[PDB]
Fold:
Amino acid sequence: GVTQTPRYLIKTRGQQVTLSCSPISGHRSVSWYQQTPGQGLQFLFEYFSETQRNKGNFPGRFSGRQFSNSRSEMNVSTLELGDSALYLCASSRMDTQYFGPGTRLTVLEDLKNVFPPEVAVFEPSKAEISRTQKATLVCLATGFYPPHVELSWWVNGKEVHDGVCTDPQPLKEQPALNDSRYALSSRLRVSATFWQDPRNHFRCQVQFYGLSENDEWTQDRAKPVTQIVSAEAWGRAD
Amino acid sequence: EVEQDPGPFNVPEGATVAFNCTYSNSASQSFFWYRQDCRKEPKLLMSVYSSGNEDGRFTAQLNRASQYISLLIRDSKLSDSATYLCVVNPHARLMFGDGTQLVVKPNIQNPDPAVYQLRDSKSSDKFVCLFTDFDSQINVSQSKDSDVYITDKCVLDMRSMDFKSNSAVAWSNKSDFTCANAFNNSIIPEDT
Ligand SMILES: *[C@@H]1O[C@H](CO)[C@@H](O)[C@H](O)[C@H]1NC(C)=O
Structure:
């Protein structure tokens, strides 16, 4: 499909950033769009045959490039807090424009507030098992910032999608704070016969996106790099 | 530019939904409806022609002189819940509208509301309260105390048994917290 790298990024105001997008094989046209929660999709630039074809009325700090392999890169210099947005790439043969996952860019004044989540799973109650013949595990991630994590359920070492529901919107822990940390919850429901088997293993995995070894850290706490925080539970007869 | 309904739309499952969109450039060669999930990217849903278009439960209408374009969803399902984007293609640059969010409430077959306590598996007192199996009409209000947290309703679909259930999670660091005082606005759950 359409590749976009990196997937997530954190940066301070005034830095330069470089996003890259590989189109579908055989697609020559590559277009960039910006998506802010306050605004909608806004065109940035389209590229065909290494040339900027159409501009989108964006400041020149939003640079763009394209190479002979139809891969396209775009830079954002002099980063500002209002640049925090999803930068989508779209490919086309040149009529249908296929979008990539997008690059999530967060701009901050402080690197100080980036925190990894704490994860915990909570075992199904016996009352639900008795009256519904079903068992709901509940995963909870707390205290992370910026609110950009990916939650997944792994049963016996294999990821599962059926029987899963995660919150679309992370919860603000202290809504009044402008620098509040976030929380997220998810549910995995199975039959009571499944949970009662003690050889079954359940795990909630929370991929948090933070810094990297490129970034500098000068705080008491460990550097909150991108990481995987997990919690687990075993099946219980009763 | 492109103007469409602010939304959100909130409709029962199986309801017919209509989407409304207007635009300035009447000569644009192509018109599209795109779909977008919350944590995802736009995806083409249907092309729209002057004769309209039809694809399963989706239909679309276009009137260039009136600058009008419409989408119609029949027998709306939970999977249809998403933001629908009206897209115009004057030369090659897609112009998206702000989009209209659509939420489809599942019809709970056998409601059995209850608030259960779920213990932490890492040998601790920590617990969460699961409000579950309630009908889709009741609205889970957000917490009114600073240190209790209540998630918005999440609709779970166990396709293996063709089963669907609403759920909301509550938890607090307060030591006065109990599962029987965590939620507000319920029906008659089994508050064991
Ligand atoms: C639909 O659009 C027309 C014009 O485009 C407008 O007059 C009408 O109020 C709209 N209806 C809704 C429900 O948005």
Remarks:
- The longest strand of chain A covers residues 134-144.
- The longest helix of chain A spans residues 126-132.
- The radius of gyration of chain A is 21 Å.
- Residues B 5, 20, 22, 68 surround 2-acetamido-2-deoxy-beta-D-glucopyranose (CB under 6 Å).
